[PDB]
C-alpha cells in the first residue's frame, strides 16, 4: 500500500533532481497481479551502460 | 540491572515522511503540438511560358 507512493516519490525526486537521485535512474515497480506475470518488486537501477531516453513527465511538466 | 524479559508489545508505530501532492493532481501540462505545414503567403506565378 506504500510502494506506488515510494515509486512516485522517487520519480519526483529524479525529475526534479532533489535528493541526489541521478536523472538516469530506472524506478521500476513491477506490480503484484496475482497472476503469472513478471516477478514483482521495486527495482531501482542507477548503474551505467543502460539505454535511457527522454520523454516528458506530464505531471511535473519537465523532461 | 537484572534485565528481565518484559511482556509482548501492543502494536507498532512507524514514522516516515509523506510526499506533498498539492502540485500533482493538477491539469496536465503536455508539450504543445507543432503546427501543421501551412502554405506561405505571397506565392505568385513566377514562370511565364515562352513566347
Strand residue content of chain A? 15-25%
Strand content of chain B: under 5%
Instruction: Identify the most extensive interface between protein chains.
Output: A-B, 9 and 8 residues
* Terminus-to-terminus distance of chain B: 120 Å
Question: Main sheet of chain A: which strands, in order across?
Answer: 1-2
Q: What characterizes the major β-sheet of chain A? A: 2 strands, antiparallel
Oligomer: part of a larger assembly
H/I helix tally of chain B: 0
Structural class of chain B: little secondary structure
Estimate percent helicity of chain A.
Answer: 10-25%
- Gyration radius of chain B, rounded: 37 Å
Spell the H/E element sequence of chain A.
HEE
Largest sheet of chain B: none
Organism (chain A): Homo sapiens
Family (chain A): Belongs to the RNA polymerase beta chain family.
Protein name (chain A): DNA-directed RNA polymerase I subunit RPA2
Subcellular location (chain A): Nucleus, Nucleolus; Chromosome
Q: Which helices and strands occur, and which strands form pairs?
A:
This is part of a larger assembly, with chains A (63 residues) and B (51 residues).
Chain A: H1 3-16, E1 26-30, E2 41-45
Antiparallel strand pairs in A: 1-2
Chain B: no helix or strand
Amino acid at each position: 500500500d506504500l510502494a506506488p507512493g515510494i515509486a512516485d516519490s522517487l520519480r519526483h525526486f529524479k525529475v526534479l533532481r532533489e535528493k541526489r537521485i541521478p536523472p538516469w535512474m530506472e524506478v521500476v515497480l513491477i506490480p503484484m497481479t496475482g497472476k503469472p506475470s513478471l516477478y514483482p518488486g521495486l527495482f531501482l537501477f542507477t548503474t551505467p551502460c543502460r539505454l535511457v531516453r527522454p520523454v516528458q513527465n506530464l505531471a511535473l511538466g519537465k523532461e | 540491572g537484572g534485565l528481565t524479559c518484559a511482556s509482548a508489545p501492543q502494536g507498532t508505530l512507524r514514522i516516515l515522511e509523506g510526499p506533498q501532492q498539492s502540485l500533482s493532481g493538477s491539469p496536465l501540462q503536455p508539450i504543445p503540438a507543432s503546427p501543421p505545414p501551412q502554405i506561405p503567403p505571397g506565392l505568385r506565378p513566377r514562370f511565364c511560358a515562352f513566347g
